[PDB]
Design a protein around this ligand. Structure first.
Ligand SMILES: CCCCCCCC/C=C/CCCCCCCC(=O)O[C@@H](COC(=O)CCCCCCCCCCCCCCC)COP(=O)([O-])OCC[N+](C)(C)C
Ligand SMILES: CCCCCCCC/C=C/CCCCCCCC(=O)O[C@@H](COC(=O)CCCCCCCCCCCCCCC)COP(=O)([O-])OCC[N+](C)(C)C
Ligand SMILES: CCCCCCCC/C=C/CCCCCCCC(=O)O[C@@H](COC(=O)CCCCCCCCCCCCCCC)COP(=O)([O-])OCC[N+](C)(C)C
Ligand SMILES: CCCCCCCC/C=C\CCCCCCCC(=O)O[C@@H](COC(=O)CCCCCCCCCCCCCCC)COP(=O)([O-])OCC[N+](C)(C)C
Ligand SMILES: CCCCCCCC/C=C\CCCCCCCC(=O)O[C@@H](COC(=O)CCCCCCCCCCCCCCC)COP(=O)([O-])OCC[N+](C)(C)C
Ligand SMILES: CCCCCCCC/C=C\CCCCCCCC(=O)O[C@@H](COC(=O)CCCCCCCCCCCCCCC)COP(=O)([O-])OCC[N+](C)(C)C
Ligand SMILES: *[C@@H]1O[C@H](CO)[C@@H](O[C@@H]2O[C@H](CO)[C@@H](O)[C@H](O)[C@H]2NC(C)=O)[C@H](O)[C@H]1NC(C)=O
Ligand SMILES: O=S1(=O)NCN(C2CC2)c2ccc(F)cc21
Ligand SMILES: O=S1(=O)NCN(C2CC2)c2ccc(F)cc21
Ligand SMILES: C=C(C)[C@H]1CN[C@H](C(=O)O)[C@H]1CC(=O)O
Ligand SMILES: C=C(C)[C@H]1CN[C@H](C(=O)O)[C@H]1CC(=O)O
Ligand SMILES: *[C@@H]1O[C@H](CO)[C@@H](O)[C@H](O)[C@H]1NC(C)=O
Lengths: 119, 56, 253, 51, 50, 51, 51
């Protein structure tokens, strides 16, 4: 954790240690009167809020890259799709065809007089 | 874990087959009762083709 | 409503309107349900049918809620629809009331940590202690198979987890995912005020407070005769029940 | 002879003999014992004693 | 009657069907929703009884 | 617990070993020696029959 | 509860379950590397099993 605003770092790769690798992420932070565009980490940090939902964390804990995932969910609407909707699309129409016939047998045909073998 | 994940169509599942393979069995015997009565209606008379239009 | 999934409650309802409409069509089609309604007058022609659409639908609802209706099928074509709807609703109810035993008493969702070694393995739950403390000094100077490993974390992330008060140790647990190693007499005060915090382990060590005097003082004996006089009289417990009282907190079960 | 015997450690010694090459005479240990520190005489008994 | 209506409610509470299964759809809904009531009360009873 | 007291190594009034025991006991319970001896003598067949 | 509850397990399950339960009697062979193992080990159970 540097104190100034100037950071100097170097790599010494004189020979076959050349294949060594390292990558960093510095973050410009301010003294802990965080006022605006400053999500206050509890580690003396006032970071800029352009680095929110960016994936890369800037504080020790992932404070800034946390609670950025929002969707909408339900009950049986979890499976309403192209694949699982093949059964609910057909079998809710099978019951509907059986219900139009059952009204047609009930209304046009009574239950009483003389109707053996009828429909 | 002995937790939740309530029963779905993967767990009970196969009584929706044996229901649907029991009603289709019952439609085929509903026709078999419709035919065996026509032979008992042929106790007196004709070859039971005109009865399948009038009674139905 | 839980022990069956919210899709398979709809496959019951489509079957309860499905079978109750298949039973109606077969009972009108079958020439053996059409019976003579007069036993005492056998040789008449008033041949009727007792399957309406009310009579067919509350057969399928009547056999689903295990009570049953009057409505008994008489032809063989409708005793196979009725006989397989009884086996359908025998398996639905038996699978419901067996899974419902697991959604009333199965367990409580316990904390992922339960002791010191459950922090020693689970690197998801973050540690914590206070800087300039006898807790931090305890893990810095102990070596028994866990407490060096717990200090293997906090030495590497000293700017992260080690805080400067007991107040910041409360706030990091209230906000972050933190497991602050507090002394066990201010855990017995904070958990009395905040009913959302807890002591998840036992006591790691055993120590105690003091009225510390300089090295070679004529008071370390005059204070402990006064402390033990306050403890035999029980006056060190009227003072602890006064301040560690709290606003009360439910155990609830 | 040594035709009286059988077992895992006789099937082993027949197959160590086809690799090295030697003739062997099986003689059971007369102590009927394996080997231990007596801690009185300070000596060994059994098969360790005949080694 | 008021006697026969309370013998439906006690009968359908104990899973033992009575002699007077209702006609007249307005009473089939009362009889149908009391069947689903006593289905859940008993199946929560016998699942917690263990 | 009705009250709370403890076990002290008694020394005569004016003994110089008293501080030498005081500093010493604080060493064992931070090394963990007073806890490992506590677990060794206060542990037995801890009633596994009610379960 | 009378179809699937548990199997009646053995009262012992390991070395320390013999170290507590004095009802179940121990045993080993004289002149053996098992008896010599408990005679010369000291790690918190195997001296108690040789006690
Ligand atoms: C006799 C008949 C009597 C019927 C009495 C019915 C009375 C019922 C009265 C209920 C009052 C409930 C009060 C709260 C309502 C909230 C709902 C909810 O929680 O949704 C949850 C899931 O919801 C689903 O999964 C939807 C399922 C479809 C509904 C099924 C209706 C039953 C049909 C009958 C079939 C029988 C037909 C005949 C059978 C042969 C999740 O939703 P949410 O996103 O978490 O909530 C957002 C809340 N917010 C907006 C405030 C943020
Ligand atoms: C929340 C509750 C849901 C359950 C309810 C479902 C079952 C309800 C269905 C009940 C069907 C009616 C059965 C009555 C018995 C037949 C006797 C008869 O012929 O006379 C009837 C005449 O009326 C008719 O002929 C039939 C017309 C009614 C509507 C047909 C079904 C509509 C489905 C839509 C809804 C289904 C969707 C379902 C969704 C789940 C009765 O007439 P009457 O007044 O007695 O007078 C006698 C006249 N007569 C002398 C000429 C005979
Ligand atoms: C007392 C009453 C006696 C009733 C007889 C019962 C004994 C019969 C038992 C006999 C022995 C068991 C072997 C059955 C055949 C084996 C083949 C198999 O794998 O199953 C298959 C076929 O099988 C079925 O569809 C279900 C079984 C028969 C249909 C329903 C039972 C009768 C209906 C009412 C009878 C009333 C009539 C009564 C008399 C009038 C199922 O697999 P699938 O089709 O490929 O499904 C797709 C794959 N998937 C699930 C992965 C998506
Ligand atoms: C894998 C196949 C796929 C395709 C399926 C297609 C195959 C379809 C096969 C056949 C279709 C037609 C057969 C039935 C026709 C009439 C029968 C009847 O109603 O009873 C008649 C005789 O019956 C008896 O009473 C005595 C013999 C008993 C038979 C039924 C036993 C049920 C066993 C289960 C096995 C069931 C056999 C079917 C197995 C499914 C009349 O007797 P009754 O009682 O005197 O009449 C009432 C008169 N009363 C009002 C005066 C009292
Ligand atoms: C008259 C008929 C109409 C009226 C009926 C009543 C009306 C309404 C009735 C029911 C309404 C409810 C809908 C039914 C299906 C829903 C369940 C389902 O998911 O599919 C099931 C069956 O689906 C299949 O795989 C097809 C197999 C044959 C089904 C048809 C039976 C033919 C009998 C042939 C032989 C006849 C022999 C006869 C003589 C013995 C299982 O699918 P799944 O693969 O397990 O699902 C994948 C999910 N997973 C990956 C998580 C596992
Ligand atoms: C106490 C509870 C109720 C008692 C009821 C007992 C009844 C007998 C019940 C079951 C007996 C059959 C024995 C099967 C056991 C072995 C498993 C097996 O082989 O299953 C086979 C099918 O088998 C079935 O599906 C059976 C369905 C029979 C339903 C009968 C209802 C009677 C209704 C009477 C109405 C008529 C009224 C008459 C009117 C006059 C295949 O399954 P699998 O291959 O092993 O595994 C699945 C793998 N797979 C998905 C790829 C396929
Ligand atoms: C439910 O539990 C969570 C703990 O996981 C409560 O605390 C939240 O925790 C997040 C980070 O884990 C922080 O933003 C805050 O400490 C809490 N957030 C909020 C919005 O409260 C949470 O309060 C509990 N209650 C609810 C209704 O979610
Ligand atoms: O720090 S101490 O004086 N010595 C250590 N111990 C006991 C060993 C647990 C205790 C136990 C309770 C105390 F209050 C003080 C001490
Ligand atoms: O007898 S002491 O030395 N002084 C009194 N106390 C504290 C007042 C509880 C305690 C508490 C725990 C101890 F182990 C010893 C003592
Ligand atoms: C608040 C702090 C730093 C103090 C309070 N008494 C203990 C002490 O005086 O050592 C510390 C708590 C701890 O060590 O966790
Ligand atoms: C049969 C006996 C005494 C022998 C067999 N081999 C082991 C040995 O030679 O040491 C012993 C078994 C034992 O120690 O339990
Ligand atoms: C603890 O946290 C939750 C979230 O608000 C709630 O149950 C309770 O109000 C909190 N405790 C206190 C003391 O506010």
């Amino acid at each position: 954790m540097l104190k100034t605003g100037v950071g100097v770092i170097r790599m010494w790769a004189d020979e076959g240690s050349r294949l060594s690798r390292f990558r960093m992420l510095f973050t410009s932070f301010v003294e802990p009167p965080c006022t605006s565009s400053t999500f206050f980490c509890h580690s003396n940090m006032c970071i800029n809020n352009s680095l929110v939902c960016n994936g890369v964390q800037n504080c020790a804990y992932p404070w800034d890259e946390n609670h950025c995932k929002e969707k909408k969910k339900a009950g049986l609407f979890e499976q309403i799709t192209k694949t699982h909707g093949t059964i609910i699309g057909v079998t809710s129409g099978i019951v509907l065809v059986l219900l139009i016939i059952s009204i047609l047998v009930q209304v046009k045909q009574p239950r009483k007089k003389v109707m053996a073998c009828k429909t | 874990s002995k937790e939740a994940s309530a029963l779905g169509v993967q767990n009970i599942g196969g009584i929706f087959i044996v229901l649907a393979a029991g009603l289709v069995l019952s439609v085929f015997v509903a026709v078999g009762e419709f035919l065996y009565k026509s032979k008992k209606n042929a106790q007196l008379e004709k070859r039971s083709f005109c009865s399948a239009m009038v009674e139905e | 409503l839980n022990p069956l999934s919210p899709d398979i409650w709809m496959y019951v309802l489509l079957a309860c309107l499905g079978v109750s409409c298949v039973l109606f069509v077969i009972a009108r089609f079958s020439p053996y349900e059409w019976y003579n309604p007069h036993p005492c007058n056998p040789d008449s022609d008033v041949v009727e049918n007792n399957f309406t659409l009310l009579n067919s639908f509350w057969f399928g609802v009547g056999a689903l809620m295990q009570q049953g209706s009057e409505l008994m099928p008489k032809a063989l074509s409708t005793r196979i629809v009725g006989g397989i709807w009884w086996f359908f609703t025998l398996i639905i109810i038996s699978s419901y009331t067996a899974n419902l035993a697991a959604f009333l008493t199965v367990e409580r969702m316990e904390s992922p940590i339960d002791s010191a070694d459950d922090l020693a393995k689970q690197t998801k739950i973050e540690y914590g202690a206070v800087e300039d403390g006898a807790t931090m000094t305890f893990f810095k100077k102990s070596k028994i198979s866990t407490y060096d490993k717990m200090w293997a974390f906090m030495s590497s992330r000293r700017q992260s987890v080690l805080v400067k008060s007991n107040e910041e140790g409360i706030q990091r647990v209230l906000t972050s995912d933190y497991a602050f190693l507090m002394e066990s007499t201010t855990i017995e005060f904070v958990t009395q005020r905040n009913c959302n915090l807890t002591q998840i382990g036992g006591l790691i060590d055993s120590k105690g407070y003091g009225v510390g005097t300089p090295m070679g003082s004529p008071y370390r004996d005059k204070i402990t005769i006064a402390i033990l006089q306050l403890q035999e009289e029980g006056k060190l417990h009227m003072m602890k029940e006064k301040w560690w009282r709290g606003n009360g907190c439910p155990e609830e079960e | 002879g040594n035709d009286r015997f059988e077992g895992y450690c006789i099937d082993l010694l027949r197959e160590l003999s086809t690799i090295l090459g030697f003739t062997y005479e099986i003689r059971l240990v007369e102590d009927g014992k394996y080997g231990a520190q007596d801690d009185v005489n300070g000596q060994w008994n059994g098969m360790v004693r005949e080694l």
